Amino acid sequence: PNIPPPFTAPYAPDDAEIAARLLPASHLSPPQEARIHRTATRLIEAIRKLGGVEDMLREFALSTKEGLALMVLAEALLRVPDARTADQFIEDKLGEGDFIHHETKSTAFLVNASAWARVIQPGETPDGTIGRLVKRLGAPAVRTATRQAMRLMGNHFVLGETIEQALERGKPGQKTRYSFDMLGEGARTAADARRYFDAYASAIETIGKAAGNHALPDRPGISVKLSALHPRFEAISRARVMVELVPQLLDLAQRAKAHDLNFTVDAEEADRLELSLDVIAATLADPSLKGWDGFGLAIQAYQKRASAVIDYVDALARAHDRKLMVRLVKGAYWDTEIKRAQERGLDGYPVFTRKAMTDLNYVACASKLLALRPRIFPQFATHNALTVATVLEMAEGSSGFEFQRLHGMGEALYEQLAKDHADIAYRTYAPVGSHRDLLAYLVRRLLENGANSSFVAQAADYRVPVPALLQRPADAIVRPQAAAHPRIPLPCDLFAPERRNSRGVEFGARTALDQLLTDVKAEIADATPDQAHAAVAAARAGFAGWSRTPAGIRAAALEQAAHLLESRSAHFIALLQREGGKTLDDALSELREAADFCRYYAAQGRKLFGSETAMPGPTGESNALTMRGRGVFVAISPWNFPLAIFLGQVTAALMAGNSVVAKPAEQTPRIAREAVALLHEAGIPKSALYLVTGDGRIGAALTAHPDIAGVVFTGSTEVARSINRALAAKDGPIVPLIAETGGINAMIADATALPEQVADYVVTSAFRSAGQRCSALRLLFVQEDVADRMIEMVAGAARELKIGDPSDVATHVGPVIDVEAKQRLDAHIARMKTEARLHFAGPAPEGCFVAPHIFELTEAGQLTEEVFGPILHVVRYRPENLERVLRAIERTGYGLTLGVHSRIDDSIEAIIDRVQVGNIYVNRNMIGAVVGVQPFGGNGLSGTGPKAGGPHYLARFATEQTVTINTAAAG
Amino acid sequence: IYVNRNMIGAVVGVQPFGGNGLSGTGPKAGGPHYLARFATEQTVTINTAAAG
Amino acid sequence: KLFGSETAMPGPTGESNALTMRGRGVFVAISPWNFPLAIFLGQVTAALMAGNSVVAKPAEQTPRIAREAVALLHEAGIPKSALYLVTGDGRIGAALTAHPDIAGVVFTGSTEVARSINRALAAKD
Amino acid sequence: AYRTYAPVGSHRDLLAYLVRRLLENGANSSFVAQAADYRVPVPALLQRPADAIVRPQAAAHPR
Numbered sequence A: 001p002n003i004p005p006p007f008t009a010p011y012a013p014d015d016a017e018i019a020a021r022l023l024p025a026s027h028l029s030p031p032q033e034a035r036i037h038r039t040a041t042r043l044i045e046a047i048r049k050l051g052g053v054e055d056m057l058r059e060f061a062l063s064t065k066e067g068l069a070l071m072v073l074a075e076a077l078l079r080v081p082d083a084r085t086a087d088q089f090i091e092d093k094l095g096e097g098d099f100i101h102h103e104t105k106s107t108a109f110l111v112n113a114s115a116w117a118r119v120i121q122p123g124e125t126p127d128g129t130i131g132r133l134v135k136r137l138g139a140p141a142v143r144t145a146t147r148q149a150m151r152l153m154g155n156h157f158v159l160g161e162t163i164e165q166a167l168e169r170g171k172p173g174q175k176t177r178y179s180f181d182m183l184g185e186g187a188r189t190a191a192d193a194r195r196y197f198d199a200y201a202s203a204i205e206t207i208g209k210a211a212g213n214h215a216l217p218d219r220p221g222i223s224v225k226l227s228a229l230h231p232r233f234e235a236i237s238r239a240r241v242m243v244e245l246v247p248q249l250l251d252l253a254q255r256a257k258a259h260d261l262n263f264t265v266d267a268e269e270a271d272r273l274e275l276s277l278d279v280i281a282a283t284l285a286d287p288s289l290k291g292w293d294g295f296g297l298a299i300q301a302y303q304k305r306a307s308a309v310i311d312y313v314d315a316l317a318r319a320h321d322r323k324l325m326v327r328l329v330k331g332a333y334w335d336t337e338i339k340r341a342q343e344r345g346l347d348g349y350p351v352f353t354r355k356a357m358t359d360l361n362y363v364a365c366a367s368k369l370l371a372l373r374p375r376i377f378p379q380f381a382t383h384n385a386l387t388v389a390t391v392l393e394m395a396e397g398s399s400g401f402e403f404q405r406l407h408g409m410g411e412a413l414y415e416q417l418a419k420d421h422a423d424i425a426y427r428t429y430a431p432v433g434s435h436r437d438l439l440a441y442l443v444r445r446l447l448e449n450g451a452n453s454s455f456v457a458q459a460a461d462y463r464v465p466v467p468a469l470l471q472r473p474a475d476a477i478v479r480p481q482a483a484a485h486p487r488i489p490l491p492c493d494l495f496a497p498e499r500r501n502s503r504g505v506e507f508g509a510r511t512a513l514d515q516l517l518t519d520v521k522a523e524i525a526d527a528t529p530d531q532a533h534a535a536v537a538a539a540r541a542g543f544a545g546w547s548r549t550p551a552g553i554r555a556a557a558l559e560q561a562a563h564l565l566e567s568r569s570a571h572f573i574a575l576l577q578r579e580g581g582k583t584l585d586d587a588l589s590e591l592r593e594a595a596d597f598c599r600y601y602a603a604q605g606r607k608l609f610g611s612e613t614a615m616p617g618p619t620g621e622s623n624a625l626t627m628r629g630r631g632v633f634v635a636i637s638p639w640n641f642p643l644a645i646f647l648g649q650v651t652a653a654l655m656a657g658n659s660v661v662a663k664p665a666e667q668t669p670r671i672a673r674e675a676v677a678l679l680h681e682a683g684i685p686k687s688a689l690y691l692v693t694g695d696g697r698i699g700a701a702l703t704a705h706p707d708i709a710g711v712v713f714t715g716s717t718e719v720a721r722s723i724n725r726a727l728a729a730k731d732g733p734i735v736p737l738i739a740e741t742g743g744i745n746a747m748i749a750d751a752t753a754l755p756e757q758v759a760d761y762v763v764t765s766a767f768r769s770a771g772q773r774c775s776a777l778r779l780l781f782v783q784e785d786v787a788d789r790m791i792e793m794v795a796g797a798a799r800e801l802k803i804g805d806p807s808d809v810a811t812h813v814g815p816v817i818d819v820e821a822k823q824r825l826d827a828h829i830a831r832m833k834t835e836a837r838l839h840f841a842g843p844a845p846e847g848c849f850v851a852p853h854i855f856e857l858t859e860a861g862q863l864t865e866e867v868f869g870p871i872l873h874v875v876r877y878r879p880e881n882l883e884r885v886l887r888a889i890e891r892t893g894y895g896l897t898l899g900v901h902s903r904i905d906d907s908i909e910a911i912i913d914r915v916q917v918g919n920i921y922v923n924r925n926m927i928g929a930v931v932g933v934q935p936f937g938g939n940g941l942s943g944t945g946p947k948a949g950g951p952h953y954l955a956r957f958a959t960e961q962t963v964t965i966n967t968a969a970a971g
Numbered sequence B: 001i002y003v004n005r006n007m008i009g010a011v012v013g014v015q016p017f018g019g020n021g022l023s024g025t026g027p028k029a030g031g032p033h034y035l036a037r038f039a040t041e042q043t044v045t046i047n048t049a050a051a052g
Numbered sequence C: 001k002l003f004g005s006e007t008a009m010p011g012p013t014g015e016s017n018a019l020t021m022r023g024r025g026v027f028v029a030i031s032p033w034n035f036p037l038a039i040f041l042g043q044v045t046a047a048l049m050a051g052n053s054v055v056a057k058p059a060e061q062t063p064r065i066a067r068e069a070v071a072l073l074h075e076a077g078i079p080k081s082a083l084y085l086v087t088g089d090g091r092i093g094a095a096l097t098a099h100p101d102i103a104g105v106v107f108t109g110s111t112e113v114a115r116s117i118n119r120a121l122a123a124k125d
Numbered sequence D: 001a002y003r004t005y006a007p008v009g010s011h012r013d014l015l016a017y018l019v020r021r022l023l024e025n026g027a028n029s030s031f032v033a034q035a036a037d038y039r040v041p042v043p044a045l046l047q048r049p050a051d052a053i054v055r056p057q058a059a060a061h062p063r
């Protein structure tokens, strides 16, 4: 049969339609249900008859953060050479003080062994995760919880500083009772991708030398992650991924085949499904994998596409005439998928949103997989007693499949299953790898053991009666229309009923990305000072009628502008790419933001200007407060968000009842002209909105005009002051100036932060849009104990960014706006090269490009200007010198964005309390403020306020009027 | 604006008082838009996904 | 109502977004002779309420009431370090408003003086 | 100094004693029960009685 086409199932179909088929098909005869019920009751009875992570979380009532901190402290304590020394520490030091120090050191130990190896003053304020733990449970219970974490870490994990040390520790002249769930994921650098490859290769040899003499399926397996093997494993980098990753995955599959092992490609996020299936298919196709039945992959039942992934895998197996071992799981990234679909404004969720639907689809999928025997050998990975009992019933035997579990979970379940059914096979995986890969793995692990819907958690809570654990999924759903979770809105309804959300696109769905790429590919004289003056006068004339147009009618025009923007998204995205130099995601994002500005100011507009506010007062008198347009606003906009900031400023002014003269940046008048024509078409009268183009001279003519009633300006600090001076110089009214200006934006990362995550956030914040965002990271402060690893990881990550033509989908970093910008940037770079350590200087293509650069400074004071390009500055610091760091941030006088990366709530809160920055971003990137979600704007040298996209913005464009009427003659 | 009564003696919280043009910048003293002008906004955005 | 608590913003799951309002810094309060108690206290307590510290310069003709008011505020709970009274002419007012460390001016008085204050502010770097 | 008492007697007198004993160990307001529930932070166990009452008129239980 034919090799199947590239996988392209619909990403997020409707749950009800799926439920309409799954509900009737799940029906079981009374004797089938009786067997299921009995088997499952027995399994749970055994479960409720050792210790696991969930038990520790439940016993001390620990959050996932606290669980994490104790397990990290436990691993550090287990690696102390002399056990008595750890014992001394636990009793004498732990819980007595140095709470943050212990948490910081034990976490740093995971990337910098040297870091972990003092005298504690009494009466120390208990802060940090551990100190807060101690205030809550008492120091003695914390010691007890750490010792339990120590038994868990020592018994359920195979760990070392290096893979060689992990592998040596996990050794059995016999066979290992465990398959390896390797720790690695998401290479950030080319060197990370090689390290993980070598770890996998080394693991396979160790596993091989101890594999026993039986045939599959009774040989050990290894689990592998595509993201570990390639530093840009993403849909937009598919071309380079097919060429680079496939040979590497092939090399490991071959090494595995030589020991006749089970080799399994793990399933990761929904946006990587298609790409992974492409990688897997091309790899499987190689003739070198013939005559071996161990190749396989995981398939996630929580996805709506799961059943189609099974069809695809089967056709693949028939086309190449292979036997595959296929792992069926529910799925480990549920929270991530919900969040991403909301952020990306998708039209639905790739996963089910009711737990019972996952459970339903898992059983339907198991049923399908069982009938693909013997070509497919199904592996059912679950620790759910009901799921196990149900799959066992459907198999009608015990041959041709196995179950799977993770070391430290499901032990009692599968022991009992083995007693009641001697021919049952189950595979046990152990997590194996290096300390530097532990944190990322622990976080994912802890979300499921801490989940309340989790079977493992409930079974361990004796409040939950056994029969509750045995509810059939079909009886929890009942009706197809109930399939979706009622308390989780679709992304388009995220703000309902306040306003509609703009639509995004899933780049990981090739149908969506291809169409978007296709639609997009398918798509000005200056003004004289006299024309600018005529513009003001014409706007002054149109003001009277526009200010008196009812607020509902002004709002309707904004909402219609939003609708037309989204309807013509391809036209505007094409402009943003060609005139703005933006990558596809930046342009799409800008388009969304422009439409979000319209709907949001429209909604705030009705609330603010829709009706008067009655003031309390004496009887026989009415007092009403209203807000009226001010006059003609002059809107001056920058080149870097030439559509969204342009429209945000303009539609705010219009919404408040002002007429507008808008002057866009010299570099981007075409998009501004398309925007203005669009507003006119949406309902803005020709007499309320005028576009005037030209240089700073034209801008200065507008702002010097005696008849204007206010200025809204976004741009350089220097120009804002001159505008402010030109206004204050007039003898007329003092008009409002709203000025959003630059920043020297810092980020603080401590040693409790995950270095791979921070690296991601730093790369994005500093280098996305070639650093041409006002919110961009300019200055990273990183704690010395993790500084070398963090810097190396950011540098290695920056080197994987494709720089080039913005219209190419694979491009990460497009050109800077113009030659003058490139000249200023290249001059700062030349200076920094003689002044500070160069950690990275990327290769730029010929043309208007500047590549990411990373410099380390001796001190923050060496950075004195905002440099508007892809250039990161790094300062390493000592933990006790945080005060010097905070002062260094205060000293610039700026205050736009600040990033904070830390596990420690008390440190985060101490930083928030201290700084005056407009936008603080904790444990995520510092860019992409969402309208109505992150009201965006800074203070000090960074801006005047109020914040754009927030609830205090519109009022500033208007003036108040109080009407007081003596009503006593009416009675 | 005062209709069929005198033009003086604005009462705090009843007649938010203050003018525009050459008469003032705003916001009106004794009204609900006054305090905000003396303050600055701060947005704190926290990724809480690790907590669950 | 305004500073008592943060405003939760709508947003995606797995993320919190809170809007707060903080003091700006040092406010200079300049008040006229014609409502020497109420406009003095209106401007002063508003700035204080918003979380700013205040340097208040009353009109030359009415410092005695201004001093009694400031003393009364201290006694009612305003720390000495949050509120200071400076008396003198327009030149003293001009000293306060030209100072590079102040975070805002609240002014009631003549149109001509407002412009000169506004010019002195815009002149700063 | 502290004195420790042991329950001493015959089986025929146990049931009546156990019932009374079990009402206090099972009580949610019970200090012993709360201290053994790690959900309850140590500072909660240390609330002074006078601060739970606050006002004389609140002395009686409202429900």
Ligand SMILES: Cc1cc2nc3c(=O)[nH]c(=O)nc-3n(C[C@H](O)[C@H](O)[C@H](O)COP(=O)(O)OP(=O)(O)OC[C@H]3O[C@@H](n4cnc5c(N)ncnc54)[C@H](O)[C@@H]3O)c2cc1C
Binding pocket: A265, A266, A267, A268, A298, A300, A302, A329, A330, A331, A332, A333, A334, A351, A352, A353, A354, A355, A356, A357, A358, A381, A382, A383, A384, A387, A404, A405, A406, A429, A448, A453, A454, A455, A456, A485
């Ligand atoms: C050996 C092994 C290997 C694995 N490999 C992978 C892999 O490569 N990729 C991967 O993604 N997973 C993988 N998993 C699965 C993941 O790690 C979890 O263990 C698994 O999802 C838990 O399922 P369950 O039957 O044990 O538990 P349960 O408590 O029955 O099921 C919990 C699951 O339900 C789902 N869920 C929770 N809430 C909702 C909701 N509101 N709506 C819809 N669904 C919901 C989630 O998927 C959650 O994990 C693997 C598991 C094992 C044991």
Ligand SMILES: Cc1cc2nc3c(=O)[nH]c(=O)nc-3n(C[C@H](O)[C@H](O)[C@H](O)COP(=O)(O)OP(=O)(O)OC[C@H]3O[C@@H](n4cnc5c(N)ncnc54)[C@H](O)[C@@H]3O)c2cc1C
Binding pocket: D005, D024, D029, D030, D031, D032, D061
């Ligand atoms: C050695 C010993 C001998 C004892 N002998 C006697 C005896 O002879 N007669 C006798 O009656 N008790 C006796 N008790 C007391 C009784 O057995 C309980 O042990 C005691 O009341 C618990 O108090 P506490 O300080 O340990 O615990 P706590 O948890 O502090 O206090 C619980 C007590 O609060 C009271 N209480 C609970 N709810 C309310 C409420 N809503 N309003 C008002 N009060 C409330 C009850 O008295 C309850 O026992 C004795 C206790 C001991 C240890």
